[PDB]
């Protein structure tokens, strides 16, 4: 029959929409209409890390806010020191089709994954002083798009298997598997308390997952196009999402619906990376039109441009202390802005 | 400065020189290709050549070619196809006999051609299963005109080059498929990439030579465009 179940689901969606509309008192744009804007924000390239011979697909800042891990399609995972432009490491990747990389919060491990469907974890702090792969995390059906570290032993990977997974690095198995996404999960970001994390997928919906429970806490549907990047607010009570429709959208976890849409008529090119500042006031988005736009996350108005990349910007990260914004584009150059 | 700072600088210099040397070693006379197609197509048997992505390394004349057959992935391909926007060509493979899935081959090739990141990438079209297509046309059990009504208004091109011991009906059918693909490639073609059609059987062994010649043409046209001669 299935029609009774379809009708019940439709009524559930309708009443969820009604509850969301009832909770929708006033827009954040209306709330922030009183405050003065941030003003023009000019960021200059303090450092230009060169040494990648091909396009840089992803990067991740370290917890110390000094060492960043960079990944490219050449087949090298170069770890830099942004203060001195010193390549502290350069790991020969087995697979050159790496789409994501991460740096451990403790600083001892580095992960990477791509079209090989395997999350390779590299031990930086080895007794012999040479980098060796610690585990070949296999178990995903599709390509990995974004993997983040919870601890030295727990890692969460977003794959294009429409499923996020939680692994045990010591055992190398599926501690907890997250399912429910209709489309390829393209990026996830971890909450400050590491208890929750949201993920963006190719079904235009971002969902909030409980790491311990392993169940989708809630779903956010406000995007008209594929979602590519996602990042929590410094509260951990909100996040922003990028999408091919060139629209950044900020959702609130407790409100269960969006707050504002960071869009403009001129921008027509899709978003590849999204990152907040330390205070969350600045929403930096890396578009694939060869530059980046800094968005005033409160006034919802553009308040700066990070131009200087020749090719499409693929990755964009902000240090934990918020002293830099290192962008990495397809022109083989990774630029730190401040 | 300090001893630690000097050691860090020496390490950085050594890493940079190693990366540069390895890159110029592994990037000289080595071209990468994206082998794309359908399951019915003989993409696994295109080149005679004497767990999440396949690999095929072959050489013709002191030039190494790499083909990446992305097979262990989901049917949705709009996301992992952007990682292959640097290849010198795309080895598109089509089963000419299966007219049922020929239309999906056509619109897949159209999406590849019109993709924003694959606009520069030039497709080396490989119309495989020519023996099957010829057998179908000669038998006449399957009718191509029902699946393509515009075949009736089609005449074989004047400059066609059929094999001497071949049937005019088979020549007309295969060149109709070729023209279909070439019309798709030339309608929206911006001129920065070209479609190189070929007729491949399951027994052909010069597919490596065909790929070599077309990649030579691709790089030659790229150089001419770079130097403002084309």
């Amino acid at each position, epitope marked *: 029959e299935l029609d009774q179940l*379809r009708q019940e689901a439709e009524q559930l969606k309708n009443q969820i929409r009604d509850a969301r509309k009832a909770c929708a008192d006033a827009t954040l744009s209306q709330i922030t209409n009183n405050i003065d804007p941030v003003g023009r924000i000019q960021m200059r390239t303090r450092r230009t890390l060169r040494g990648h011979l091909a396009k840089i697909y992803a990067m991740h800042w370290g917890t110390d806010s000094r060492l960043l891990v960079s990944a490219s399609q050449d087949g090298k995972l170069i770890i830099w020191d942004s203060y001195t432009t010193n390549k502290v490491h350069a790991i020969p990747l087995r697979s050159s089709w790496v789409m994501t990389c991460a740096y451990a919060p403790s600083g001892n491990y580095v992960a990477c994954g791509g079209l090989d469907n395997i999350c390779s974890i590299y031990n930086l702090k080895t007794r012999e002083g040479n980098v060796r792969v610690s585990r070949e995390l296999a178990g995903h059906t599709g390509y990995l798009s974004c993997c983040r570290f919870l601890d030295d032993n727990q890692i969460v990977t977003s794959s294009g298997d429409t499923t996020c997974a939680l692994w045990d690095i010591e055992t190398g198995q599926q501690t907890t598997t997250f399912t429910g996404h*209709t*489309g390829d999960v393209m990026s996830l970001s971890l909450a400050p308390d590491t208890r929750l994390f949201v993920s963006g997928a*190719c*079904d*235009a*919906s971002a969902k909030l997952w409980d790491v311990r429970e392993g169940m989708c806490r809630q779903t956010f*549907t*406000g*995007h*008209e*196009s*594929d979602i590519n990047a996602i990042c929590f607010f410094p509260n951990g009570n909100a996040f922003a999402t990028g999408s*091919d*429709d060139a629209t950044c959208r900020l959702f609130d976890l407790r409100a269960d619906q969006e707050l504002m849409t960071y869009s403009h008529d001129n921008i*027509i090119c*899709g978003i590849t990376s999204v990152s907040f500042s330390k205070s969350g006031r600045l929403l930096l988005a890396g578009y694939d039109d060869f530059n980046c736009n800094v968005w005033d996350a409160l006034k919802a108005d553009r308040a700066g441009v990070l131009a200087g990349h020749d090719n499409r910007v693929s990755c964009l990260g902000v240090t934990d202390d918020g002293m830099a914004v290192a962008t990495g584009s397809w022109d083989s150059f990774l630029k730190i802005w401040n | 400065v300090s001893a630690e700072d000097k050691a860090a600088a020496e390490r950085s210099k050594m890493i940079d020189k190693n990366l540069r040397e390895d890159g110029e070693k592994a990037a000289a006379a080595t071209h990468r290709l994206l082998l794309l197609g359908a399951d019915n197509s003989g993409k696994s048997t295109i080149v005679k050549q004497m767990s999440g992505i396949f690999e095929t390394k072959f050489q013709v004349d002191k030039v190494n070619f790499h083909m990446f057959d992305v097979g262990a992935q989901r*049917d*949705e*391909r*709009r996301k992992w*196809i952007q990682c292959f926007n640097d290849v010198t060509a795309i080895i598109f493979v089509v089963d000419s006999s299966d007219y049922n899935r020929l*239309q*999906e081959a056509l*619109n897949d090739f*159209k*999406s*590849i*051609w*019109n*993709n*924003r990141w694959l606009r520069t990438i030039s497709v080396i079209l490989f119309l495989n299963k020519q023996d099957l297509l010829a057998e179908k046309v000669l038998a006449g059990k399957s009718k191509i005109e*029902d*699946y*393509f*009504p*515009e075949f009736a208004r089609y005449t074989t091109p004047e400059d066609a080059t059929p094999e001497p011991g071949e049937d005019p009906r088979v020549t007309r059918a295969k060149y109709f498929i070729r023209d279909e693909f070439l019309r798709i490639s030339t309608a*929206s073609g911006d001129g920065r990439h070209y479609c190189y059609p070929h007729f491949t059987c399951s027994v052909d062994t010069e597919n490596a030579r065909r790929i070599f010649n077309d990649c030579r043409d691709i790089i030659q046209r790229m150089h001419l465009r770079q130097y403002e001669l084309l």
Partner: nanobody
Amino acid sequence: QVQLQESGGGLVQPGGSLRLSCAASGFTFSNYKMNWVRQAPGKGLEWVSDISQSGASISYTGSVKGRFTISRDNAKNTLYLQMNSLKPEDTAVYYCARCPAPFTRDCFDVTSTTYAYRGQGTQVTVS
């Protein structure tokens, strides 16, 4: 929130005429290249027609060339497929599917098995 619910269809005698209509919500209907796809019983999805965002371009499958007409209403956010002079093989589940990205002339995953942007499917039967 992005529901491409379509209407019309049902049961019509062979050679009849059914007009399928599609309702698009949650996105700018004038930015996405709309598609029509059918799924025959026990068969994979087959792309039927394609109309550009502005409606200038247009294309059809060879099996339904001249027998199906596709039309979009940008103001009404509705997409139509004028099925007339039907044939027995037209019996299939029709989905109103849009191409994943706006301002793009390519459509990669429209015919996918579990594509995200498509309708539930209005059954069309002829006998």
